[PDB]
Write a structure and sequence with these properties.
Halichondamide A, monomeric, little secondary structure, cyclic peptide, 0% helix, biosynthetic protein
């Protein structure tokens, strides 16, 4: 739920 809502990430 990173950015965007995705696994450990920040795209």
């Amino acid at each position: 739920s990173c950015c965007p809502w995705i696994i450990w990430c920040c795209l």
